[PDB]
Amino acid sequence: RPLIGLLFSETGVTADIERSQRYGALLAVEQLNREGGVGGRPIETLSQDPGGDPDRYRLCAEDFIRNRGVRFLVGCYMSHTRKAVMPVVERADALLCYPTPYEGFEYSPNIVYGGPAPNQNSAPLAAYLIRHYGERVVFIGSDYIYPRESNHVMRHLYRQHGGTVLEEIYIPLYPSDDDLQRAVERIYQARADVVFSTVVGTGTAELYRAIARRYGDGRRPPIASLTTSEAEVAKMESDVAEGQVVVAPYFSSIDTPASRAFVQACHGFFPENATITAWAEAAYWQTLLLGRAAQAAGNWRVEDVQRHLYDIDIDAPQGPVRVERQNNHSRLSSRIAEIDARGVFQVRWQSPEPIRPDPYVVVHNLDDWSASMG
Amino acid sequence: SANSLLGSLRELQVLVLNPPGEVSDALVLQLIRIGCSVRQCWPPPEAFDVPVDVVFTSIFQNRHHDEIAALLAAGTPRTTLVALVEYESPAVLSQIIELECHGVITQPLDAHRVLPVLVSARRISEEMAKLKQKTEQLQDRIAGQARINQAKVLLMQRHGWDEREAHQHLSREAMKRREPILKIAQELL
């Protein structure tokens, strides 16, 4: 049975981006079913809502693999939700596509990483920030492993290039009102040139609004984020969102027919409460790759499908992508964008070509990015 | 050092800053028996001319007091000072205190009083000069230590280095540019 299990929250702290991933994956299934399904048989999907809880992700993965015969999964966002599912898929010899940016330092034979490792997003973003913004920075992130690992690198990068990391603040994943106010007051008391955010999900919008109001509605330090997506920026007033900085392989404003085709496809298929994001883009291309690899194999056997996966370079909405057989990570484009006054993402820099993944690199050499940014 | 102090008395250059007369004479004769190089001078000059290690003078109620005072105020601090005193009353004693003698000899002087006073006063002035020298060394040291420590924190934090690494780097550059560790540290700061 060509059945893809979709493990994306519907509820919880990251519900917006993960609903976005779910529809991107569903969009692909639909397109694959118009291309002949898998050997005449239509591709089916099964969805469960783990609600951002790592233990519920594990339980949903276990239900799918144990009781539904699922061997192909698309899902997970926050890194600890990936860690909770990983062992289940590896013991069942299943294949999980993770269309999410992450901290790196992982190799799983059963995981196809469709989102960037730090050499593909944080590094270029660090080079950019040190290049254009003042060197006194203040960090604010949600309290879980990804923002913490992401801050661990950024802290070291700024100190190496003559910067000062004034405050490094963490707030809980569903941050109370007091949490935000205390955090914003510290940000306001540090007088930073830039705010580097790693806050993820619900509370992102409120955070950016509180920074906004707090400041004397005047030439605040800009917010540069590794995590904020289009789903968070749509919840922001025009003036709050304006001038904020964001990084991703894809932005709905990209100027290509491939990007245009994806926007249109998403607009006529996604619900009202599901914004297009870079992670919907990644769920789409990965789910699409799965289907074509299966079509080329003629079956739905992980071993057969998987073999055909490393050989199919796809034409994704972001540009051309492929999965490297050596590390299960992908060759991804990387864009840095500044939000204009009408809430639109203006790409300010792009890597000249897709960046090859190197999840374990410890020393990020920022000189790599001198030519293309200055 | 009691031994080296005693052994170096014959190299001391002693000046008897006192009017010509019996007192000066007897004092110069006893300093020559002890073996010091001894000169006698009078009226007090404005600067010495030749290096002087120990001055013997009397207490005058007139302008030689101020002359002598100024003469030794401007002089080498290691110059030992011994006053010949004949009164125990407050203005005379205040003069001794204000001159900051390292030793006194009450009059009438006789040969037996000289050597014990010259030695105890010389120990005293040398110990004072040493404590002052240690004070400057320690002041410089506290300041130095601070900049070596702030520079080390700087390297640590810049590079993601531990204390030992920061120390190895300072030492290496320092001992490759033939300069003090402190100069490297201050360059960084």
CA distance A48 to A33: 21
Any residues with CB less than 8 A from the CB of A197 and at least 6 apart, and which? A139, A140, A141, A204, A207, A223, A224, A225, A226, A227, A228
Give the distance from residue A123's alpha carbon to the nearest chain B alpha carbon, in angstroms.
17
Do the Cβ atoms of A156 and B160 come within 8 Å?
yes
> What 3-state DSSP class applies to B92?
helix
State whether CATH 3.40.50.300 applies to domain A2-116+256-332: no
Contact A160 B160 (CB under 8 A): yes
The count of other CB atoms within 10 Å of the CB of residue B140 is 11
Q: How many whole angstroms separate alpha carbon A33 and alpha carbon A234? A: 31
Strand partners, B57: B17, B83
For A327, the token pair is 């590390």
**b/e map B52-78, b = 16+ CB within 10 Å:** bbbbbbbbbeeebbebbbebbeeeeee
* Stated resolution in angstroms: 2.2
* 8 A C-beta contact, residue A285 and residue A314: yes
Cβ of B158 within 8 Å of Cβ of A159? The answer is yes
Which option is the CATH number for A117-255+333-369: 3.20.20.70, 3.40.50.10800, 1.10.390.10, 3.40.50.2300? 3.40.50.2300
Q: What is the dihedral of CA B132, B134, B135, B138, to 10 degrees?
A: 170
Q: Is the peptide bond before A172 cis (omega within 30 degrees of 0)?
A: no
* 3.40.140.10, 3.40.50.620, 1.10.10.10, 3.40.605.10: CATH of B144-189: 1.10.10.10
Closest CA to A289 of A79, A19, A24: A24
Contacts of B158 in chain A (CB under 8 A): 159-160
What number of residues does chain A have?
374
* CA proximity to A157, closest of A68, A226, A227: A226
Tell me how far apart the alpha carbons of residues A144 and A98 are, in angstroms, rounded to a whole number: 18
CA geometry: angle at A251 spanning A368 and A52, to 5°? 100
Could you tell me the maximum CA-CA distance found in chain A, to the nearest angstrom?
A: 63
Measured in angstroms, the CA of B69 and the nearest CA of chain A are apart by 58
Half-sphere exposure in the Cβ direction for A217 (13 Å, CA): 4
The answer to whether A2-116+256-332 and A117-255+333-369 have equal CATH topology is: yes
CA distance A334 to A336: 7
B1-127 is classed CATH 3.30.420.40: no
The tally of CA atoms less than 13 A away on the side-chain side of residue A250 is 30
- Which residues from B are below 8 Å from A156, CB to CB? 160
- Please state the domain extents for chain B: 1-127, 144-189
Helix (H) or strand (E) holding B41: strand B37-41
> Closest chain A residue to B160 measured between Cα atoms?
A156
Q: Does A160 touch chain B (CB under 8 A)?
A: yes
| DSSP output for A135-200 | SEEEEEEESSHHHHHHHHHHHHHHHHTT-EEEEEEEE-SS--HHHHHHHHHHHHHHT-SEEEEE--
Residues contacting residue A257 through CB under 8 Å, at least 6 positions apart: none
Residue of B nearest to A163 (CA): B158
For A161, name the nearest residue in chain B, comparing CA atoms only.
Answer: B158
Mutate to test the interface with B, among A155, A159, A164, A362 (most CBs of B within 10 A): A159
Q: Cα A269 to the chain's mean position, in Å? A: 21
The chain B residues in contact with chain A (CB within 8 A) are 157-160
| Domain positions in chain A | 2-116+256-332, 117-255+333-369
The distance between the two most distant Cα atoms of chain B, rounded to a whole number of Å, is 79
Distance from CA of B147 to the nearest CA of A (A): 19
Burial class (CB in 10 A: 0-12, 13-18, 19+), B1: exposed
Q: Which residue has the tokens 């955090």?
A: A183
Do the first three CATH levels of B1-127 and B144-189 match, i.e. the same topology? no
Q: Measure the CA–CA gap between A175 and A179, rounded to whole angstroms.
A: 6
Q: Do residue A160 and residue B157 have CB atoms under 8 angstroms apart?
A: no
A152 touches chain B (CB under 8 A): no
Between A and B, how many residue pairs show a Cβ–Cβ distance under 8 A?
A: 8
What residues contact residue A133 under an 8 Å CB cut-off, 6+ apart? A193, A194, A222, A224
**CA–CA separation, A65 and A3 (whole Å):** 11
Question: 3-state DSSP call for residue B15?
Answer: strand
Closest by Cα among A202, A183, A168 to A78: A202
